């Protein structure tokens, strides 16, 4: 059984920051999507252009699994047709997205008493991200005459901020692990099918 490696995406010890989101290419394997219930506990699940109950009947050219952490009240921006600070500057689904967005609360893994400042997000950007564009620049934006020289300050804007997840937060501000499963259908031989 040449099963797709969903485990290393969904069961990864640490997830990426949303601005530096991870992408796993999934090709030439059997995708048993029923195993996702064991890798992620009690997860939210929205599909677009596919029905969630027929995933094991479908064949795709490739699958992509993008993963990152955002706070709970941002999960709604990981959807086609959405705008917001995450959709605009961090991770952008296209309006014609075909795939599923899976999110689950990761407070137990990703919050810390003092705050998890390792998860970060981008604050502003020269333009909105295009679909599946990734911007990991940390360069300080120089607005004034004086060069910044890697020192944020007056007229010198560091473009990221940390979430600082703490377990005292309400769920809307708790960390959620997100996996975006993209289902790519080209006019080409399929390489990812359900068990059937």
């Amino acid at each position, epitope marked *: 059984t040449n099963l797709c490696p969903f485990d290393e995406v969904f069961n990864a010890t640490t997830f990426a920051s949303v601005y530096a989101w991870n992408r796993k290419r999934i090709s030439n394997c059997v995708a048993d999507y029923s195993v996702l219930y064991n890798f992620a506990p009690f997860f939210a699940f929205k599909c677009y252009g596919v029905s969630p109950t027929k995933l094991n009947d479908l064949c795709f050219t490739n699958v992509y699994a993008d993963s990152f952490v955002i706070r709970g009240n941002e999960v709604s921006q990981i959807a086609p047709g959405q705008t917001g*600070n995450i959709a605009d500057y961090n991770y952008k689904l296209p309006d014609d997205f075909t795939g599923c967005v899976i999110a689950w609360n990761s407070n137990k893994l990703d919050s810390t008493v003092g705050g998890n400042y390792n998860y970060r997000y981008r604050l*502003f950007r020269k333009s909105k991200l295009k679909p599946f564009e990734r911007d990991i620049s940390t360069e300080i*934006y120089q*607005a*004034g005459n004086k060069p910044c020289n890697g020192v944020a300050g007056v007229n010198c804007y560091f473009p990221l901020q940390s979430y600082g997840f703490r377990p005292t937060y309400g769920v809307g501000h708790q960390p959620y692990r997100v996996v975006v499963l993209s289902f790519e259908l080209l006019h080409a031989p399929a390489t990812v099918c359900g068990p059937k």
Partner: antibody, heavy 123, light 111 residues
Framework: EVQLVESGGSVVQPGRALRLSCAAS????????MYWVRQAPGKGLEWLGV????????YYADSVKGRFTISRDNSKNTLYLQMNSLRIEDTAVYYC????????????????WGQGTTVTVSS | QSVLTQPRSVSGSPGQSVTISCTGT?????????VSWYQQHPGKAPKFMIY???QRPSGVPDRFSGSKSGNTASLIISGLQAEDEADYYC??????????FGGGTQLTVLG
């Protein structure tokens, strides 16, 4: 410290037009989304609109859409508000304000404000 | 978007906590966490105090915080000080890069 200075406020009759300007000191103007907000005497703030740092897009509150036009001249470090079809209820202090963050930002707030210019619409 | 509903006035003595509510609709403050607060002293331009419901921009005293429940956001001022006597305006994102202000609350510091 960028300084924002609004000008152009005056007494104007209903139905007439008025252009306000907002001049920014220094050079940071071209890096920031810029906003107009007004405040009628004794009343609350009213958000009017925003123009992207690069002029790529402009957005308007429903209360001024189709009547007021926001523009900017980055070569002059100046923001404009072209007010057409003025009504008594447009009487207010008009503020220009800059986005807290540069580039495309929008989601945070307005951290530097001018002192305002006063528009009195009256016959 | 209709003006967001704030109480007309609130009062407190120095050292007390004071709270100001800001009620909107499911299309503005109930839809977004982009909720900001401004302070305005008499004759002065507004000053940016809170964004993202409870974050403080550079220089704003830690005494200012916020919370939000559904369609209502709150400004929470701990350790009230004489200088906090001012009008306070909430503002919420309303979609499509538009914001709307609340009607304002006059805060009196019994002095």
């Amino acid at each position: 410290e960028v300084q924002l200075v609004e000008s152009g406020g005056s007494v104007v009759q209903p139905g007439r037009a008025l252009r306000l300007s907002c001049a920014a000191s220094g050079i940071t103007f071209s890096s920031f989304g810029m906003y107009w907000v007004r405040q009628a005497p004794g009343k609350g703030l009213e958000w009017l609109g925003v123009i992207a740092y690069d002029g790529s897009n402009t957005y308007y509150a429903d209360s001024v859409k189709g009547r007021f036009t926001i523009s900017r001249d980055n070569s002059k470090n100046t923001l404009y508000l072209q007010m057409n079809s003025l009504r008594i209820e447009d009487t207010a202090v008009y503020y220009c304000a800059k986005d807290y963050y540069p580039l495309l930002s929008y989601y945070y707030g307005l951290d530097v404000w001018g002192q305002g210019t006063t528009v009195t619409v009256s016959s | 978007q209709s003006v967001l509903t704030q109480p007309r006035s609130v009062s407190g003595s120095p050292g007390q906590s004071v709270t100001i509510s800001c009620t909107g609709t499911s299309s503005d403050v109930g839809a977004y966490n982009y909720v900001s607060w401004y302070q305005q002293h008499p004759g002065k331009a507004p000053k940016f105090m809170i964004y993202d419901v409870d974050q403080r921009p550079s220089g704003v005293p830690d005494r200012f915080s916020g919370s939000k429940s559904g369609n209502t956001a709150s400004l929470i001022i701990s350790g009230l000080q004489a200088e906090d006597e001012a009008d306070y305006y909430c503002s919420s994102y309303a979609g499509s890069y538009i914001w709307v202000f609340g009607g304002g609350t006059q805060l009196t510091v019994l002095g």
